[model samples]
Target: HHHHHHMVHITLDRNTANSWLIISKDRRQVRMGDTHQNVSDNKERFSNYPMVLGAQRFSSGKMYWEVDVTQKEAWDLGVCRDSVQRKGQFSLSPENGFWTIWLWQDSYEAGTSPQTTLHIQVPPCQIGIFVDYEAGVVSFYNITDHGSLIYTFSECVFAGPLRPFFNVGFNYSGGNAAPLKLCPL
Candidate 1:
């Protein structure tokens, strides 16, 4: 059975600073664009979105996600999952102005094996995230690739059934400006 999905289109102005597109099942917490940082036990600079599922704790399932990012310079763009107390987060990104996908897993404790995966030179462009939950796959594609698959995840632990918060963000490394547009799939 196929369920009807809703798509929310968000456009960012050229002068806008680094922004976030936060998604949740609850419209009350769906934060789009810039969010002010508040004091929290976790030192994370931003907690833009919270995933929820009908009063249940954070759990994940099939979620449609996408993003369009325009950057002046090469940037690192990807999603983070299983963030335990701001640790043990996995992410993909580019390296040293080179267009590539590198996966990194944070170690919650000291001296633990660092679970890292790297895919070099996936594509040279900016923008896009697609997740195929049934196949346990999460993909990052170049918008200029004509929606071609640039990167893929074979397995992931996003089993939380709560509303899955899809995010699109970037880390600027000494260059011009970067902006992103997120659309729900």
Candidate 2:
């Protein structure tokens, strides 16, 4: 078993939330908003997707954090390079500067170039994300299984700061929607 020793703190960044997303005032939760706000065309905002990023960035060294997704039915969370374009529809893969895992219906899919599948009895309620940026490794874990790994992106070519990235199923305005929230590690 690999030892997990690195740690960092991060929170949901409201500035990066897409128009359809709503970020809590404390910056701890992010959810799909009921309606799109008249947001400016800022570089940090995700223009074509229901996504958001963390306020913290990891440019080098090892880093780790966790998030709570227990109340949501679908979501994608991981890390992405700051330089990755966010103005239009894009693939959530390392080739496009994104490395994340998706949960929908009842399956877990790593956001790899061709996408990878991991079938589990239950979707993880909370997830742990660890990154060894200098070594080009990013991993996701199932918090309920003694931190058992879910997936990892190896040899990731990060060109700049890598921040925590997240997304909710675009159609989640389903009346009982829940926001993605940062968990205190």
Candidate 3:
């Protein structure tokens, strides 16, 4: 029942961020800037998505991190396998190496093959993610709702390390511009 010891610091990886994303200098926040920056093209950089990966990778441990997604109309959060696709447009699902939950417009959905719709009692201001790497479990918690569980992904077969993933959807007519900030424990 104790997760204090599992809290770990997470920072966004500069090389893995999409050109349209603006990562803070500290690498603790990310948002859709919409202007293509002169970022060197790399295999790890997302070519068609407004997403970023954390700098740290976990292989076998219980680790937790929190993100402040309040007022965000569109975003995605969770963990993805190290080898997940970054170039082409792909579904955000475990089979595609992504285990995530996202908010699209007014609905919440888990990144399943068919995309499971989530009916939440309250909108989350901040969300916590916990990963038990050896146990093959990734859990999402609504930190604003007394730490209630939102969803869990189990039976994950990790062939390599897992990295925290984030997607701050594009700004549409000035909507969804709020940044996705990493919270400290």
Candidate 4:
């Protein structure tokens, strides 16, 4: 069997009721992959805040990601997982990058948002949450070179089956994305 590699696990506290987490990954630096598991309850009241996860594959310039919810009133953004290399953090905006993954309240709004560019020096870093109850958009971006667009989902269905495990993988020419592919004990 093939076991996937685990990179990072982030859990938002209840205190962060209205916040976000931003993660960025650079393929050129690390050989290992990363994982993001959402322990938050997928109920309407508990999982209302907006969440975003983004990563850049350095070799092919392709990016992958996913999101939960977005707010429409206030801009309550959060930057949870960050790179140890840089001291600064990631932020959310419509003008971030060319490739982006945005999660909003409506399909029209999600499609209308402009494409932003992302900038990163790492392989796999998560761009945290940015909860805006007024705007109703849970967004992610590649915020390195003028910000880019990766992907986006709207009206986050956090009430039904809670897909708790969202992950990203990386591999070289002869390497494997899922190296071990083992089951957790």
lDDT of each: 0.33, 0.81, 0.90, 0.25
When summed lDDT is taken over every stretch of 10 residues in candidate 1, the lowest stretch is 103-112
Model 3 ranges with Cα > 4 A deviation: none
lDDT of 4 by residue, 1-185 (tens): 01112222333222222122222232211112233234353222113223222231122111222222212211222222221111123333233221223222222112224433333343222233232223333344433322343334444322221112221122233232321111112
Report the candidate with higher TM-score, 3 versus 4: 3
With candidate 2 superimposed using the best TM-score fit, by how many Å does residue 94's alpha carbon deviate from the native? 0.9
Can you give the lDDT of residue 70 in candidate 2? 81
- Provide C-alpha RMSD values for all models, in order: 10.0, 2.0, 1.1, 17.4
TM-score of each candidate structure, all chains considered together: 0.43, 0.91, 0.96, 0.24
Best by lDDT: 3
Best by TM-score: 3
The positional error of residue 123 in candidate 3, measured at the CA in angstroms, is: 0.4
Where does model 2 exceed 4 Å of error?
1-4, 172-176
Clash numbers, per candidate: 8, 0, 0, 73
- In candidate 1, what are the lDDT values of residues 1-185, reduced to their tens digit? 12114222333221111124343333322333344323233343233322111111223334433444443332233333333222234322211111123212221111112323433343433445444445655555555656555555556444532222222323334332343335444
Residue lDDT tens for model 2, 102-166: 88776789998798887655568889898998899998888877788788788888888998998
